[PDB]
Amino acid sequence: GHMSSTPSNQNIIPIIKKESIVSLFEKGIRQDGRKLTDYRPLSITLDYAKKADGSALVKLGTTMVLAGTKLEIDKPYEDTPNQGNLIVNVELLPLAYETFEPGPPDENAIELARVVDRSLRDSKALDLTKLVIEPGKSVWTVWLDVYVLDYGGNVLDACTLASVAALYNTKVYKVEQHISVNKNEVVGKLPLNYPVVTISVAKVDKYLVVDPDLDEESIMDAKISFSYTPDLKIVGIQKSGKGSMSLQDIDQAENTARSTAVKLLEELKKHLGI
Amino acid sequence: GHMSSTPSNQNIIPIIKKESIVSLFEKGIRQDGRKLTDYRPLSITLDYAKKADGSALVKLGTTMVLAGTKLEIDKPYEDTPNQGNLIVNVELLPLAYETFEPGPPDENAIELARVVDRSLRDSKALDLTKLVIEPGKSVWTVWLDVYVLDYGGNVLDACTLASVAALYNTKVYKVEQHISVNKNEVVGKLPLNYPVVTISVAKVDKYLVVDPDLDEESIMDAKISFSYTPDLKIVGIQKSGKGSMSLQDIDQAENTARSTAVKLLEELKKHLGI
Amino acid sequence: GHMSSTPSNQNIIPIIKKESIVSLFEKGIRQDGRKLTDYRPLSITLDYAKKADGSALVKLGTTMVLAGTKLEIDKPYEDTPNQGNLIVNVELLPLAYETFEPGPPDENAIELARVVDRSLRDSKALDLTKLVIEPGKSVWTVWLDVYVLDYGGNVLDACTLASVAALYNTKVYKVEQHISVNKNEVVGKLPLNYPVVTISVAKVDKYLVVDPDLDEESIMDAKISFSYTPDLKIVGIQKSGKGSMSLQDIDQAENTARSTAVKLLEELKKHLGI
Amino acid sequence: QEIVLQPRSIVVPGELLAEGEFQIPWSPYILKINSKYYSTVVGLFDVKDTQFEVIPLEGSFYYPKINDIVIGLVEDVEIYGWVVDIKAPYKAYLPASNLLGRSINVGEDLRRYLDVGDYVIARIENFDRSIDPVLSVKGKDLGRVSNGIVIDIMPVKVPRVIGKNKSMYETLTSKSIFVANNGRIWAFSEEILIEAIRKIENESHIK
Amino acid sequence: QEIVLQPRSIVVPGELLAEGEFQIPWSPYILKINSKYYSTVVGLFDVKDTQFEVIPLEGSFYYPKINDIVIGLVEDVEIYGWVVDIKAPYKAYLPASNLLGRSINVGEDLRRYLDVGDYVIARIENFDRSIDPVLSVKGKDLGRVSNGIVIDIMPVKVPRVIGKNKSMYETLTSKSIFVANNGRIWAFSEEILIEAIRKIENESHIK
Amino acid sequence: ERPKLILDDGKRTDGRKPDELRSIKIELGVLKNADGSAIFEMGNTKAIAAVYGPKEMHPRHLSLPDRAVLRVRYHMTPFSTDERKNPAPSRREIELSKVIREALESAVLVELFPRTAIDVFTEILQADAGSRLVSLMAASLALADAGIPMRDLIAGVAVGKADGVIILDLNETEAMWGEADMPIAMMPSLNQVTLFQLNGSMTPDEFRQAFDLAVKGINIIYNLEREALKSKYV
Amino acid sequence: ERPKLILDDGKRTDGRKPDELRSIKIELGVLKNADGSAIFEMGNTKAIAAVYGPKEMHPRHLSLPDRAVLRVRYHMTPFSTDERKNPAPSRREIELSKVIREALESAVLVELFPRTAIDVFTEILQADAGSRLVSLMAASLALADAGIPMRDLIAGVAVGKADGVIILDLNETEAMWGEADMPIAMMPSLNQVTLFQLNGSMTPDEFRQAFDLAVKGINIIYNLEREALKSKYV
Amino acid sequence: ERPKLILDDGKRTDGRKPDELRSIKIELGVLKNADGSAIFEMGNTKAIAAVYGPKEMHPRHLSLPDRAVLRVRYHMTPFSTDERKNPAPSRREIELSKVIREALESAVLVELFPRTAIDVFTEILQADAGSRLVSLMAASLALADAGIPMRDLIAGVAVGKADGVIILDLNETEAMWGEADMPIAMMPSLNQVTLFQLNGSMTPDEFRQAFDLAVKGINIIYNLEREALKSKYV
Ligand SMILES: [Cl-]
Ligand SMILES: [Cl-]
Ligand SMILES: [Cl-]
């Protein structure tokens, strides 16, 4: 048995600091000089975790996420004989933030995993029917494990980037019939239709801000995240946080997120080599 | 690893209130005007939980219990190839009482489940050899889940009533050989030999009281429960609570419980349509 | 998720008592009159737990350990079709010491189990290829459960003794092909190559002491344990405790442990009837 | 009636000692149920005059009595005092003000007064069923211990170790020892008195 | 002998600094083991006269010293006082009586005195290894902050930010700032002094 | 995908039009111990909620100096679903408990009760889609029944897309086989959204069409919630 | 059902008459650290118990102002049973720990030690029926060995029915295959029942016959418990 | 056993001589939130560590009056190993967390910070043998990066035996198939051993040969640790 409780503030910021953070919003810029619609600097390092089948280290500002995959052969589920499997796990490591404690995933890490999983699944980016080896008998299971090493704000969008990059980076090994996996021979890469991105918009009083940092997350009213494929279909939405927003805020937020998505997808594709 | 500890009083009642509760016991009646041998008003609503295979909502005074079943096909256990399975779970929901917290079943809910399970099993009411589909290969598993929604005293007897009623209410679906369950066709009801009842007798100083309410449970010395089939065989006994009772108290209690059982079985049968 | 924390002292000993404990170390003897190289009195009672397949109750001073085995037939692991299985569990019972609480094995009991398991395995004393019934299809699993009933110091060495004695004491039952185990017919004893011992040396200032008691463990700087077979090969080493030791201390400790091992192996063999 | 069932006997929980209405002061070792008295412990039935008692033979714990002289062991040091272990179910507290004869000062408290692992001889200045015992160092030859051996025993055995008119206390002093109420004794060279003061535990019931 | 092994060097934990018996006051940054002295930190070896010290280059925390001037941040409001964060391992407490100059009254305490999220300038009136630091607002220009920017830094860097004879403190004031012991500085329009006071952190070891 | 979700009459599998709600039934004061309680039924989806509170919270360090702490549980009974659900909380239940708590945080006037907990427990008795919203609205009603001050009641509904048609208040067939499912809850008098999620896929224009349709349903539901709460006094 | 439980000589499978106890062996002061300890053997069923206490309890909010709290554990070793038992507590162990604690609550004079815990730990070393009672009696003896005041010792035995015959002190074959098994424990000098359970089925007259037979066994056991406790002093 | 571990050139499977270390790479200040951090790579084994501390500890009864409490976690990522590792802590991780904490207890000057906790978290990103030591050394470096006073840094390496040859700094093939694996860590300037374990089997003379070879490796590593820590200031 389990229950969700209001947390303590794990980043109580002084009145005076709030005023500074929002002081240049009138001019359309923030603390760090970025525009209200700009992401922080992004680096994506593929194959960072050398024993992973695929991996990506994402640095987004001071947020750092390491995603890695491992593939296994399994019998398919009885209800899905013609599909492989995807299993998404996110951990918010106690390395990542001072008030994080070790333990199994709390509700925040569970939420992250489930939002990312849905966005990957509902996007149709990873067609699990492509993961079948022998219909009804043997399929690939893709374990995706996503570790937040440095909690610097907007961890959701970094987790999506890392997850997509790790999947793109995933090697597929030769299967030998006697069935075995021969790891000396890479025959393929995991087949994806396209990348996906998640775009998080925070409401700070009368302003909407893309890619909130730690300080901005500490003062925001609420946040909403929108997932996109390259055709700019919306493939997931999640309002998060204690505060409410108006219908009009959400409308404006989606319009702003979608404009940013175009640019983020382009940058991610450069990072992926596609 | 685990251990049982003396609890705090979760219903500390004032000296003055105790005197009132027992004030009319000399005349053979209680707070609510009921006789020392009377149950509180009982309603039993069958098929209350519409996606359950069978269900019953029992209201006994202010105690409310919802029982529901779900049936599954399983291979039988190796030691019991010629029997199906019954699995009893009781939860004392944090909805039910102010001091209840969510978590897995505590020792009180575990005890309830196990007392009910024994009474059902040892009564021979549910002959598990009747639950076989293909001997050695396929049998029915009956999951019985019993939820205490409102803790108003004597939850054991309400749990037994709800459990028996839900089992009686259980639909059996057609099994299609290719083996599958076709839920569009009800071919049967779960086969029971007879109902069972559990009767709880509380000792309050020099008096014995049937069907203790919350206040009576808060002042009782101990309680003892006796399970009966319609032939008035005793099919389970459980002394519960911190206090002791004499051999003579237990003897008197059984005689009193058995007299009440006759009437309760009759009322339950009306509720069941048998 | 889990983590290891510095514990509280569960045996804070007064300055004055420390001086007494070490007062005769100059003369080469301790509190109880034993030499710095002597074990406490050892008794080993075989077949103490009558429903165990083999068992041994070890008393070493005031330390008491009960080890017991149970054997089961299992399919072998896919990577080891030609070996049976050994599973070692140690529990530090809340019976054993005042500050022990019930719960699953803490890090101390987990460490004990794993040190004993390695010493048994790496010693080659129990050749798991001897536990095969039908290659690739059926093997023996040896469950070894080791219960510390009285925590009196040097529980590791008592756990090793009890584990080896229980394994030696293990009855093997006839296997009937239809495959079943017939417990009416003992056909064998578990086959061991030789016994193993673990020898724990505690550093107390400038002295090294074999077989530390509770008081000595309460004042020691650190301890190191060395496992031996009868050829005096070293078959495991574990430094334990908060303090460091020099390379020279470790060298001296090993030389001292090995001298004691010869005598302990001899005494254990008498106890085993080999 | 008013009758006693036993002479100087070994007694066990639930054992009927006496029938009648005696005017006995309440004891934890005797349970009165209307006109019957029962032992609550493994013990020695002791009749003195017209009254009776049970002397416990078993038990590792000390029950605080106000004004008892007690030798404890410091475990924790709080802001304004020291937590002390006296082998009781409750731990004792020695206030700083009591030790100093004055209030703690603005940057005070090393531990030269008292640190963890120090033995203290002290008296119980406050205790009841509603609060933990409070210690006082005020008296003479109380306070910290510097030298000597401190021997731990069953508090239950303390009255045998002293003995009738301190007879057992005499026959130990002259052999080669302060006996607290606590089941702890503070104590020539190579004095192995301990080996004898353990033998009193193992034979107190005898002769 | 009595010898020193290094000039003005970058130092690391375990690094031998000196051999001999110097008469050095105890420091957390130096470990003396008989006749050898070792650094315990990443730092800068500093010899002054005949003695020596290690200046730490690393560390995010402030260690309370009595009478330090400190700018904290209120986090909790208890019945009779306010819990304050001063970037230390221990949190500080500002008593209500100290702020008011009088006792709390029967229905007192909104927060117009001090609420959560307020910055306070204050002095440490009590602290030792046995207790958490106690704050005082008594002095002039202590108490709550109303206006200005408050810049956070490594407390380790505080002495470089002030500098020799407050030289570094001068060359900042005139450019466009109170420097507490706390690693926090209270501070014209569009004053981006912060971008420079971060550069002192990143080059303190240099020249 | 498998069954037809929009039939040739342009109606849905259960006979409803795209802009029609399932039938609603609300009962209040259903439990004796709970400080407040409610049963909410939307079609064949049924939740019960119980509230206990303002009360002091024992782990004082888990309390908040300026606010009450909301403690919330969304749980499904094993027999609420077509196939038995394991009673151990699932990852789904953990996520939904958080999303439901955060919705309630916007409504409940928690700063009235410093250092207290308000406990909100909900159980799904029958799941036929939309159970997070039915849970949330039962909780809202149960809080009102408990006399715990709030800014507004919360009404919610899931909109979505089925065989290309934007539809209001999905049933389980549509939730399972449709193209999108978007639960939205609001404080309708305050024009404020408290819960907002989408799963599946929609174009940006479809999303705006759906949001608009949800508001129409929410307003109907809100009035039923108001009337239910008033009904015993009038 | 499968094996014959009453043979043609009218004796039981282990040679006993219906009114005969298994042999009993009691050892006290078996553990050095425990404040009190005991081993109790009844036939091939063997338990060890250890007691620690009166001591202050750290979670003060879990303590009681007027009483000590009893903390009790019934646990079976993995090798105590015919087939290996998993060491994780089972639902059976959880139930039995409670029933054993509540039995001890009637005997231990807990109001002597406000705000304390008395810890009682028992382990089944060999299980051949009746292990809850053997555990309870080892705990009772261990509490006496610890000098913790009690109203009375607790003695107990299981009666039952096998092939229609009422029998005293069941073995495992009878517990498994018989028609009824009824563990009863008492404070015999006080005429008070502390534990009472029945599983299986009996007529009301059979129940009274069995209860009567249990009392006869209990009285024998009680005397052995008294003698065991006195034995070291005499 | 299966593959040849020492080849006819007398070299190892990865081309190294018996007395040669794998290549080492150290990065410091890798994480923004952590008070200190480090990445340590030894061959293809890679760990990251983060430190937070001295800070007051909330469960005051778990704190120590005279010392800080070290809280330490060794954890392996699921994708660090050849076959996926389950993220739930294993018995191995529990043991290694303790052995690593006790090593650090000898070095960290914990008595400087009474009643506090110093938190040390390490994660294995790639496991190719020796990960307990790589973890321990990353923790040591991370503590230095955090400015937490210590007696000395800790350097460590595993020695062992492969096809009868004593070898320095094992790779995974050697750890799996060799005859012995002996991790040793020290405070090298203080001549003190902080971690010492052996698995497998060695004669007493082989053990002494191996210990000697480990010291040579440790001294090389120690100098690299010193230089890494100084590198940003020079
Ligand atoms: Cl839902
Ligand atoms: Cl039993
Ligand atoms: Cl390793």
UniProtKB/Swiss-Prot annotation, chains A, B, C:
GO terms for biological process: rRNA catabolic process. InterPro entries: ExoRNase_PH_dom1, ExoRNase_PH_dom2, ExoRNase_PH_dom2_sf, Exosome_comp_Rrp42_subfam, PNPase/RNase_PH_dom_sf, Ribosomal_Su5_D2-typ_SF, Rrp42_archaea. Keywords: Cytoplasm, Exosome. GO terms for molecular function: mRNA 3'-UTR AU-rich region binding. GO terms for cellular component: cytoplasmic exosome (RNase complex). It holds the Pfam family RNase_PH_C. CDD domains: RNase_PH_archRRP42. Belongs to the RNase PH family. Rrp42 subfamily. PANTHER family: EXOSOME COMPLEX COMPONENT RRP42, EXOSOME COMPLEX EXONUCLEASE RIBOSOMAL RNA PROCESSING PROTEIN. Component of the archaeal exosome complex. Forms a hexameric ring-like arrangement composed of 3 Rrp41-Rrp42 heterodimers. The hexameric ring associates with a trimer of Rrp4 and/or Csl4 subunits. This is Exosome complex component Rrp42. The lineage of its organism: Archaea, Thermoproteota, Thermoprotei, Sulfolobales, Sulfolobaceae.
UniProtKB/Swiss-Prot annotation, chains D, E:
GO terms for biological process: CUT catabolic process; exonucleolytic trimming to generate mature 3'-end of 5.8S rRNA from tricistronic rRNA transcript (SSU-rRNA, 5.8S rRNA, LSU-rRNA); poly(A)-dependent snoRNA 3'-end processing; RNA catabolic process; U4 snRNA 3'-end processing. SMART domains: S1. GO terms for cellular component: cytoplasm; exosome (RNase complex). Residues 67-138 form the S1 motif domain. The keyword Mitochondrion does not apply. Residues 148-197 form the KH domain. Non-catalytic component of the exosome, which is a complex involved in RNA degradation. Increases the RNA binding and the efficiency of RNA degradation. Confers strong poly(A) specificity to the exosome. HAMAP family: Exosome_Rrp4. This is Exosome complex component Rrp4.
UniProtKB/Swiss-Prot annotation, chains F, G, H:
Its main location: cytoplasm. SUPFAM superfamilies: Ribonuclease PH domain 2-like (SSF55666), Ribosomal protein S5 domain 2-like (SSF54211). Disulfide bonds: none annotated. GO terms for biological process: gene expression; rRNA catabolic process. One of its GO terms (cellular component) is cytoplasmic exosome (RNase complex). It comes from the Archaea. It is an enzyme of class 3 (hydrolase). InterPro entries: ExoRNase_PH_dom1, ExoRNase_PH_dom2, ExoRNase_PH_dom2_sf, PNPase/RNase_PH_dom_sf, Ribosomal_Su5_D2-typ_SF, RNase_PH, Rrp41. One of its GO terms (molecular function) is RNA binding. Pfam families: RNase_PH (PF01138), RNase_PH_C (PF03725). Transmembrane segments: none annotated. It is found in: Cytoplasm. Keywords: Cytoplasm, Exonuclease, Exosome, Hydrolase, Nuclease. Its EC number is 3.1.13.-. Belongs to the RNase PH family. Rrp41 subfamily. Catalytic component of the exosome, which is a complex involved in RNA degradation. Has 3'->5' exoribonuclease activity. Can also synthesize heteromeric RNA-tails. Binds RNA. Component of the archaeal exosome complex. Forms a hexameric ring-like arrangement composed of 3 Rrp41-Rrp42 heterodimers. The hexameric ring associates with a trimer of Rrp4 and/or Csl4 subunits. This is Exosome complex component Rrp41. The lineage of its organism: Archaea, Thermoproteota, Thermoprotei, Sulfolobales, Sulfolobaceae.
